[PDB]
Design an enzyme around this catalytic site. Structure first.
Site, short mmCIF file in Angstrom:
data_model
loop_
_atom_site.label_atom_id
_atom_site.label_comp_id
_atom_site.label_asym_id
_atom_site.label_seq_id
_atom_site.Cartn_x
_atom_site.Cartn_y
_atom_site.Cartn_z
CG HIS B 55 -2.31 -0.55 0.93
ND1 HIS B 55 -3.06 -0.19 -0.16
CD2 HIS B 55 -3.05 -1.45 1.62
CE1 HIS B 55 -4.21 -0.84 -0.15
NE2 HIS B 55 -4.23 -1.62 0.93
CD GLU B 57 -2.65 4.67 3.51
OE1 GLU B 57 -3.76 5.08 3.91
OE2 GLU B 57 -2.50 4.09 2.40
CB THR B 155 -13.27 5.07 -40.49
OG1 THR B 155 -13.30 3.63 -40.58
CG2 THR B 155 -14.52 5.61 -39.66
NE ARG B 170 -3.58 0.73 -29.11
CZ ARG B 170 -3.13 0.03 -30.15
NH1 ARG B 170 -2.11 -0.81 -30.02
NH2 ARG B 170 -3.72 0.17 -31.34
NE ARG B 193 3.73 -1.42 -30.87
CZ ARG B 193 2.60 -0.72 -30.97
NH1 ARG B 193 2.63 0.57 -31.31
NH2 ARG B 193 1.43 -1.31 -30.76
CB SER B 220 -20.36 -14.07 -33.24
OG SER B 220 -20.64 -12.74 -32.87
CD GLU B 285 -7.12 1.30 -31.04
OE1 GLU B 285 -5.95 1.26 -30.58
OE2 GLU B 285 -7.43 1.94 -32.08
CG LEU B 290 -17.71 -3.30 -31.81
CD1 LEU B 290 -16.32 -2.92 -31.26
CD2 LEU B 290 -18.77 -3.24 -30.71
N1 LIG Z 1 -9.66 0.96 -34.64
C1 LIG Z 1 -9.60 1.75 -35.72
O1 LIG Z 1 -9.69 3.16 -35.65
C2 LIG Z 1 -9.40 1.10 -37.05
C3 LIG Z 1 -8.10 0.70 -37.37
C4 LIG Z 1 -7.88 -0.08 -38.51
C5 LIG Z 1 -8.98 -0.44 -39.30
N2 LIG Z 1 -10.27 -0.05 -38.98
C6 LIG Z 1 -11.39 -0.45 -39.86
O2 LIG Z 1 -12.50 -0.97 -39.16
C7 LIG Z 1 -13.27 -1.66 -40.12
C8 LIG Z 1 -14.29 -2.61 -39.48
O3 LIG Z 1 -15.45 -2.65 -40.29
P1 LIG Z 1 -16.92 -2.92 -39.69
O4 LIG Z 1 -17.52 -1.63 -39.29
O5 LIG Z 1 -17.67 -3.87 -40.56
O6 LIG Z 1 -16.50 -3.75 -38.40
P2 LIG Z 1 -16.48 -3.39 -36.85
O7 LIG Z 1 -17.51 -2.38 -36.54
O8 LIG Z 1 -15.11 -3.00 -36.45
O9 LIG Z 1 -16.85 -4.78 -36.18
C9 LIG Z 1 -18.05 -5.38 -36.57
C10 LIG Z 1 -18.19 -6.56 -35.65
O10 LIG Z 1 -18.71 -6.12 -34.40
C11 LIG Z 1 -19.69 -7.03 -33.94
N3 LIG Z 1 -21.00 -6.36 -33.88
C12 LIG Z 1 -21.58 -5.52 -34.80
N4 LIG Z 1 -22.80 -5.12 -34.36
C13 LIG Z 1 -23.00 -5.70 -33.17
C14 LIG Z 1 -24.06 -5.63 -32.28
N5 LIG Z 1 -25.14 -4.90 -32.56
N6 LIG Z 1 -23.99 -6.35 -31.11
C15 LIG Z 1 -22.87 -7.12 -30.82
N7 LIG Z 1 -21.82 -7.18 -31.70
C16 LIG Z 1 -21.89 -6.48 -32.85
C17 LIG Z 1 -19.66 -8.18 -34.93
O11 LIG Z 1 -18.69 -9.09 -34.47
P3 LIG Z 1 -18.92 -10.67 -34.68
O12 LIG Z 1 -18.26 -11.04 -35.99
O13 LIG Z 1 -18.28 -11.43 -33.55
O14 LIG Z 1 -20.41 -10.96 -34.76
C18 LIG Z 1 -19.19 -7.54 -36.22
O15 LIG Z 1 -18.59 -8.39 -37.17
C19 LIG Z 1 -12.27 -2.39 -41.02
O16 LIG Z 1 -12.73 -2.49 -42.35
C20 LIG Z 1 -11.01 -1.54 -40.87
O17 LIG Z 1 -10.61 -0.99 -42.10
C21 LIG Z 1 -10.49 0.73 -37.86
#
Ligand SMILES: NC(=O)c1ccc[n+]([C@@H]2O[C@H](COP(=O)([O-])OP(=O)(O)OC[C@H]3O[C@@H](n4cnc5c(N)ncnc54)[C@H](OP(=O)(O)O)[C@@H]3O)[C@@H](O)[C@H]2O)c1
Ligand SMILES: NC(=O)c1ccc[n+]([C@@H]2O[C@H](COP(=O)([O-])OP(=O)(O)OC[C@H]3O[C@@H](n4cnc5c(N)ncnc54)[C@H](OP(=O)(O)O)[C@@H]3O)[C@@H](O)[C@H]2O)c1
Lengths: 358, 353
Positions: B55, B57, B155, B170, B193, B220, B285, B290
């Site tokens: 802790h 303290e 995006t 992060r 990193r 899923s 992320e 999602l």
């Molecule tokens: N983090 C960032 O800023 C970043 C970085 C690099 C790339 N990206 C981009 O992110 C894109 C992702 O595309 P996206 O919009 O189709 O995918 P997403 O939003 O990242 O993920 C979709 C997944 O989320 C889950 N999901 C969706 N709706 C849901 C709901 N109502 N309840 C529970 N789970 C749900 C499902 O997973 P399940 O398959 O398990 O059902 C689905 O396949 C990529 O194409 C990539 O280019 C983003």
């Protein structure tokens, strides 16, 4: 020569602050400020107010009178009626001008002065003089006016649609900012789709201003920006709100519409290019007609084209923190394959994001 | 005298500031700071470092020793066996304590005659353990949803300054959340990193102390394969599955079972599930879908949007497109906190209320 470095840095700053008092009412003329110092005290000051009004340099001298003889004139832009005779007549040693004339071979104004014994210099705080006349400076150098493209968006990237001008911009403070920006532009540009769907007035409402209300802008000096509306298809009508406002309204047309319009409505004829009205030739044309600056209030389609044509000099982006969904369509869409952030500020509960073409 | 409640504003500030030194490495435990003042000089200082480390303290009192007897002990959060023996003659706790069955530990000392007076600079104490505090009061861990966007919704392909900025965010979170959809499309590491941090590099965060957040993947359909980079990184990676996978995974891979809901995994149960799992904070992320879903199920506590000075194509996707999110006008709304420049990008911070 370090004391005078600061000493000049101060009067020039004042001479610029004065120049802006004219920024709402000066078009198509540049803003210009003038400050005249004698033995370390300001003997005459002046700046450009209206378009048909006498120059800043002249008010400054008519105020300074016999006291102009001794010394120094800080001007905002190379002096040049005969306006250079005026300065000689009063009898000033030294003039310090911020930037020399924008146009080419006419950069000789200072030499004319040098000739009559006067000491001169240019360049001091020039960068800011540049900022004070973005539009008129560009019009002279290039064919065109400086186009500002204002977008409003929600967090999720959507906007408005068919809701009325009043709902373009949600928050009081944001509405108030937009009025302020409109109020400095030469023209406001808009599509025919927008006029049709929203029946806007697209005027500057003087009450909606902050403490520029006092600055210049006495309510009677109010100068309504020139309304430019685009439409190839001659769809807008003489009864729409936009033509009933005080101030000129200009239609960019692809072919003469025959109806009676009031005396304050003009039309500009523009060639067609790949289907619809040639945006680029409109911009030149408006430049030939001395529009320094054009503030765009358009929907997505038009903002899209302007950007694709690469005619937008700055983007003013307003984000509100609300989420939407389907009713109100996206903000751009773009097939083709540019920008950099400048100022970002809060505007009550909205943010405003300035981007610049450079 | 009122220079007492002015001299205190100084010492408690040191206490809060010490506590922060631990945000990166402390999870699932809270951040805690202690400053022991005697006659004007801080005779003892301490703050919570590792997961099961002494802790605040304990270090503060070992440091002080005999000189603890005389005066005041400034805490961040309420303690309890060593404080009394060492014999301080006043404590000042910042906040009562969230856990709310308990809250009589401060009184338990008034008991041993030791003067008490809580509530000082509490504003910032709350702010120091947002996640933990949230997770204690509700079952639900604190969610930060990252959003990278272009000038036109839509995006990552934002700056390296932005990449380094997210690295530090992060590092402060207990866990990172992504979708299988992101893993497949980007084969990421979603690690921290150490060489991407700036001057946390020094104040604490010593390289070998470096703690990798927990990696959570919503998957899923078990699409993610046992040979993707995400499971071969140093640390734990937990798969949210609708049903057990039969493959052989590396040993650091756990799998949490969650029931289906209208096609997909049920995010609301998952969040409550992760709170039982002891997760304070989740950094999210993933793409628009999602994100749309998290916002619409009211699960997001804060928003970090990066805008980039770029226009993308038509076939670019964004929140602006997307069919499902009609009732988003009705989920909890946000408010702008801080806006700032990040290299060539802006970062906009939105928060709950
Ligand atoms: N983090 C960032 O800023 C970043 C970085 C690099 C790339 N990206 C981009 O992110 C894109 C992702 O595309 P996206 O919009 O189709 O995918 P997403 O939003 O990242 O993920 C979709 C997944 O989320 C889950 N999901 C969706 N709706 C849901 C709901 N109502 N309840 C529970 N789970 C749900 C499902 O997973 P399940 O398959 O398990 O059902 C689905 O396949 C990529 O194409 C990539 O280019 C983003
Ligand atoms: N900030 C806001 O929230 C706000 C502000 C303004 C408008 N709006 C909304 O926007 C909606 C209108 O959007 P919209 O997309 O239908 O129309 P728009 O973008 O306002 O204007 C489209 C018009 O611009 C001209 N145009 C389009 N593409 C062109 C090109 N490539 N080259 C030359 N000219 C071109 C055409 O005019 P012609 O066919 O007449 O030649 C076209 O009809 C309205 O509902 C209005 O409420 C919202």
């Amino acid at each position: 020569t370090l004391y005078i470095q600061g000493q000049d840095e101060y009067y020039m700053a004042r001479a610029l602050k004065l120049a802006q008092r004219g920024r709402f009412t000066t078009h198509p003329n540049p803003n210009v400020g003038c400050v005249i110092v004698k033995d370390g005290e300001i003997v005459g000051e002046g700046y450009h107010q209206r378009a048909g009004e006498p120059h800043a340099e002249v008010h400054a001298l008519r105020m300074a009178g016999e006291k102009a003889k001794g010394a120094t004139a800080y001007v905002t832009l190379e002096p040049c009626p005969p306006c250079c005779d005026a300065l000689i007549a009063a009898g000033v040693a030294r003039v310090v001008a911020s930037m020399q004339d924008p146009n080419q071979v006419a950069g000789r104004g200072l030499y004319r002065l040098q000739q009559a014994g006067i000491d001169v210099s240019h360049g001091l705080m020039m960068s800011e003089a540049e900022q004070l006349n973005k539009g008129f400076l560009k019009r002279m150098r290039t064919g065109f006016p400086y186009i500002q493209l204002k977008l409003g968006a929600s967090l999720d990237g959507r906007t408005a649609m068919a809701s009325g001008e009043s709902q373009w911009i949600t928050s009081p403070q944001a509405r108030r900012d937009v009025q302020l920006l409109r109020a400095q532009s030469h023209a406001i540009l808009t599509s025919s789709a927008t006029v049709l769907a929203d029946d806007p007035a697209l005027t500057v409402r003087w009450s909606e201003l902050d403490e520029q209300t006092q600055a210049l802008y006495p309510q009677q000096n109010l100068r309504q920006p020139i309304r430019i509306v685009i439409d190839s298809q001659n769809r807008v009508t003489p009864v729409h709100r936009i033509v009933q406002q005080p101030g000129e309204t200009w239609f960019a047309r692809t072919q003469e519409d025959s109806r009676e319009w009031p005396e304050t409505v003009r039309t500009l004829l523009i060639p067609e290019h790949k289907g619809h009205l040639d945006l680029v030739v409109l911009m030149m044309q408006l430049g030939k007609q001395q529009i320094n600056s054009i503030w765009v209030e358009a929907g997505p389609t038009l903002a899209g084209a302007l950007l694709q044509a690469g005619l937008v000099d700055e983007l003013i982006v307003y984000i509100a923190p609300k989420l939407l969904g389907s009713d109100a369509r996206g903000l751009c869409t773009l097939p083709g394959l540019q920008f950099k952030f400048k100022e970002i500020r809060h505007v009550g509960p909205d943010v405003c994001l300035h981007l610049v073409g450079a």
